[PDB]
């Protein structure tokens, strides 16, 4: 399983509540990549992951995915697209999907005005709505490459029980 | 050619009225998969297609696609995404497209309020509008994998002649 | 399965109604032969099928039948005898039957006066009655060559429900 | 880099203003395909590129992409989807992406009412908004296949400096 | 890392609070064993893990530990001793330690009267104090076999901030 | 095609106007050399091209020319002679011409008094007239080595339409 969401949507809260009583392991993909790179001796510190040569970083992604595939059924956590100075970056290249072979991609959503409120209490609502629409396109592209199912989960501010009630049927 | 649409959009009516006088054979993909599985002795009854092992079901899709490719130019019929308890399932995995190599994907649409009306006379309008948006994303992803052209056809309740007039130029 | 009938008997209507909700593919044999010849590069236009050398046309029939046999169980559609300036031409030679191996030949019939009325609103009644008798002889010859069953279906003008009720038991 | 947009969005103006003082070469992809086909002796005139056999045209796309990859870092120019009588055609098939391996896809946008105004001074606003949405789906599918980043640039009528200020950070 | 504790000591709470913001993956060992056995086809349901042949269960433990060792630095979770009708069962046999090679064993403790209070609000205090003493012996035996460090963390009812302040320095 | 001119003659403006709507790629030679050296890992920044060993810089010129020759018909851009502290440097050595095999060298000119006016608004008129004469000698030497044609184009201050009308016939 892969769980995904825009920064501010409350991804970790819904995942922690829905995964309660589950026998499934819980895995941040960036953490595994750092662990694999560190045990291969390529890095020592978490920021060095951004300094690696891109074509070495492809093989770190490949090896991390092979090892998560060997672990078996898992709640993997990462962004589906990351916003950057040069625009949106796909969080899951084809060479990851060919190794992981996900059964489900789960996408968490809330209203742009709710997310803007949460972010202000910590982009325009138009840029939030854009990043959400780009995530839907990215998820369905990942699905078509892999045979993975795509689930959308709403997580409105007052209504965490709805997000958990929609998420738990997937597990 | 592949023809696709959401349940209730009137797909079969537009397909048969546009295919009138065409030399092209017509084919339901699920029906051919059942036929191939049955002639390979893997099943006897239509429900058993849901009971097959997924990694056998991949090869049944592959063989059905190879045989529909050997038949040549055809009006193939299937859903582009199927709604399920775990969310949207891609109806055409990459291993189907690499065998069929479609020249066109045709997508049928109507207003969510019309579709809700037809369904009530037999999901919310928002979930209908979502499933349409997910189908557009799926179709263009399938196109990029294959070189297939993508055509959208409107099929408003009274206006079947517009749908048929838009469809016939494709054939 | 093969469905057959004299021009004007309403062949397509009875097939379309009885095949409703069937998982079977729906194939015109002339269309397959054109598709096979076109993809073998032998022709580009449908009228060129009448211009092919007869011993090439035998192999086009043979290859079309092999590919329909690979597709498996199907509602195939063609005439059992075609009327021509030199008289009746058999629609299905032995080299087709040895490949398709049909389980059923279905023959649609109506009164010569009904057929003459339909044709007048679009041959003598004696020539219509002759062509029907020649079709029965052709069907039973095909049966004896192949082990196929032969079914006769009446389709009187008002009584389409009787034609469909006789046809549906075959499917 | 690849730069893309709908006809009327002002693609060339934003490209040439942002590329001012850049050491990067600029390349029209259709122009290179014509050049490669012409130097391979396949054509003499630009219109003959539409007359080529599709499976030859795949190899021309492949060879043009290999040569543009060997040139190195470049501002490549083409449409991401081309509107045709049979609907939208993908501008960049997978066999192009596996050769070019783009670092960025850039997508230029403007309001449908602005584009309709420019086109009227030279589709409905609904069909313009549709073609833009189909381009977003195409770009993100291309991204997932390649690891390319996706940037969106607004180019409103009076506001060319905003388009150039968004574009220059990519180069 | 391995985190361990007696049922009712609040193990999961202190782990969740201390692991906050860590890049380390989180793994229940029983979950991995079920996943490995399920993917090896040995079982389908979680209760069948108790029905396996003991010498198969040794090899499942061995394979699960090899796959966790390949994943690298991790917050592993399991009991150090499990209470059963036949008395205490060691949670981590030598064939697990030779694969995992832990750097730390972490042992969570609370007063027998606090644990009795938590268990009532849902063994004698003597049997609780015995099970704690047997865990200390088990942990220090595991340490001597492996070179792992052993840390004890108090988790008194109101004082969760002390438990988290002691746990976070280990990570 | 190669376009050439003295700094201040307005080379880019005449090229940009004449090449309007051309299918030809547009290429700065210094940019390609930097791109080739950068992708060979020899440099990271544009100024390091002056720091290269001359006998490496020859092979970079050779490889850049081979890759621009593989690209086919092109509007290449560079100076025909570069003024330096040690005098005039030839912009195109024999080892470049043997690879590019130009069909045309185009040389842009204006009155030394006009150029001095432009350079004042941004050498003596005698030194400007000298650099032009040295460019004519260099161009005709390049022609004799290669079989390239030589075209001279005037670009007087107001008369850009005359310059573009002389340039466009070459393309």
Residue numbers in the entry:
A (entry chain h), B (entry chain k), C (entry chain r), D (entry chain o), E (entry chain d), F (entry chain w): 1 to 122, 130 to 178
Text of the article:
Comparing the experimental cryo-EM structures to the computational design models demonstrated that AF2 structure prediction was quite accurate: The all-atom rmsd for a single monomer of I3-A6, I3-D12, and I3-A7 were 1.3 Å, 1.7 Å, and 1.4 Å, respectively. In each case, the rotameric states of the interdigitated hydrophobic side chains at the designed interfaces corresponded well with the design models, as did the polar residues lining the periphery of the I3-A6 and I3-D12 interfaces. Several of the polar residues at the I3-A7 interface adopted unintended rotamers, likely due to small shifts in the backbones of the loops that make up the interface. Nevertheless, essentially all of the polar and nonpolar contacts at each interface recapitulated those in the design models. Slight rigid body deviations between the building blocks added up to alpha-carbon rmsds of 1.6 Å, 2.2 Å, and 2.2 Å across the entire 60-subunit nanoparticle for I3-A6, I3-D12, and I3-A7, respectively. We found that only one of our six designed nanoparticles (I3-A7) successfully secreted from transfected Expi293F cells when an N-terminal signal peptide was appended, so our subsequent engineering efforts focused on this nanoparticle. Second we circularly permuted the subunit of I3-A7 so that its N terminus was present on the exterior of the nanoparticle and available for genetic fusion.
Here, we develop a general method for designing self-assembling proteins that uses predicted structures of oligomeric proteins from thermophilic organisms as building blocks. To evaluate the accuracy of our design method at high resolution, we used single-particle cryoelectron microscopy (cryo-EM) to determine the structures of one nanoparticle from each of the successful PDB seeds.
